[PDB]
């Protein structure tokens, strides 16, 4: 489970800060478990891609 | 980490109307998104990954 997320095999969703700029966007821009999306009560589908490696480790930090 | 898991506070995409803020769906035409399980997301993902 530590070697798995090194390969990126654990698709743990990155958290959307909601108060600090990130690499979020819409569904279409995800391409350029693919990405994790939210529908805020005052916004469109905000989608942030899972990291290609250390997704679980990056989430835990 | 499993108590952190049974509370569903780590979102793992299992492997569509959408929904720091926890993302509530994982998406791959229209935007089709599978919801993340409320509790034991990592456990269910591992159970399906080996099955």
């Amino acid at each position: 489970l530590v070697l798995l997320d090194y390969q990126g095999m654990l698709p743990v969703c990155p958290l959307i800060p909601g108060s600090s700029t990130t690499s979020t966007g819409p569904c279409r821009t995800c391409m350029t478990p693919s990405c994790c999306c939210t529908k805020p009560s005052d916004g469109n589908c905000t989608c942030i891609p899972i990291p290609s490696s250390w997704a679980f480790g990056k989430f835990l930090w | 980490l499993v108590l952190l898991d049974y509370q569903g506070m780590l979102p793992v995409c299992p492997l569509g109307p959408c929904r720091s803020m926890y993302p509530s769906c994982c998406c791959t035409g229209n935007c089709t998104c599978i919801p993340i399980p409320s509790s034991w997301a990592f456990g269910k993902f591992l159970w399906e990954w080996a099955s």
Partner: antibody
Amino acid sequence: QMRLVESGGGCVRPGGSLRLSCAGSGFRFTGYGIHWVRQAPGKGLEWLAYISNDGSKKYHTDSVKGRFTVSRDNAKNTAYLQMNSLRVEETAVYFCAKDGYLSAARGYGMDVWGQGICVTVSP
Amino acid sequence: YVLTQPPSVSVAPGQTATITCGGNNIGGKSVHWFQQKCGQAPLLIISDDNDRPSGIPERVSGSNSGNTATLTISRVECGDEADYYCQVWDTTSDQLVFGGGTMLTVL
């Protein structure tokens, strides 16, 4: 509901300056980046600037780069666009529109538009 | 990044309208469609090239593929007369680009 109000427009001399405040309400102003668009009196929409959900990334058009400068204050729930060295062909209707995505570095698309404040520039 | 869009489209009450804005690589970009009636602020009617917001009539449907992205309004009322604007974030130069606007006419 979600509603943006622009302020600070009006007649200015050719070469003057303005700061269009943009008071947003009904939404979490801290989580969405604010665009700034202008529409000439009878022509199409023209993007003017964008500022991220906190202020880290700010983008400008090439025709306004080095003259216009976006800014914001999430505590006051406002967004500003300092427009310096305003030219004659700069008269338009300026809108501030919130981006539709939380904490995005790029303004992929507006969600709620402002009312639009009419800025005129003439002697 | 030029976003070509027809200057005008004329339809009849009951027929359908197709406003097709086209870029070089518009298939790899998030096309948003806004509606602006005369003397009013533009209104987002299509997002993510197809996601219709809340309150927008279901007759409105966007599309995006290849070099062109189209907005189709089916069974247009006389109240659909407006200017419809494409909008994409050009990531190569990091600038938002609007189309030329298509003045819909519903006779």
